[PDB]
Design a binder for this molecule. Structure first.
Ligand SMILES: CCOc1ccc(C(C)=O)cc1-c1cccc(N2CCCC(F)(F)C2)c1
Length: 116
């Protein structure tokens, strides 16, 4: 049973998160937690029960909250699923989410092979 050290996870997985941050404009809606009052979308927390964003994932990596790589992947996918659930298919946020999911799939695969 492989035990992953926090710095091993940070060194392997942080570059995949940085690849999402580097997408501009597509990462802009995801860099900070959704603020429904500021954005004028007060129904947000009625629809999205478990919010997630890039800055929260980065903090979890920096503070050793993930014991296994799949837990990090689950949080990235939670962020994507929240955006596809909440936003309309024609919206900027939905299409930007779809682009981030393509980028993430490409970056995470070789990294998971290396962590095996
Ligand atoms: C359109 C209502 O804002 C949102 C709705 C939903 C969600 C989620 C993640 O479900 C996010 C945002 C959000 C948050 C910050 C910035 C931005 N943007 C600023 C730059 C231009 C832009 F990238 F197109 C959009 C969008």
């Amino acid at each position: 049973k492989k035990i992953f050290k926090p710095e091993e996870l940070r060194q392997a997985l942080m570059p995949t998160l940085e690849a999402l941050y580097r997408q501009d404009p597509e990462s802009l809606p995801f860099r900070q937690p959704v603020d429904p009052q500021l954005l004028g979308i007060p129904d947000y927390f009625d629809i999205v029960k478990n919010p997630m964003d890039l800055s929260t994932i980065k903090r979890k990596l920096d503070t050793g909250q993930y014991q296994e790589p799949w837990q990090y992947v689950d949080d990235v996918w939670l962020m994507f699923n929240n955006a596809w659930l909440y936003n309309r298919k024609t919206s900027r946020v939905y299409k930007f989410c779809s682009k981030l999911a393509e980028v993430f799939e490409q970056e995470i695969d070789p990294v998971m092979q290396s962590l095996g």
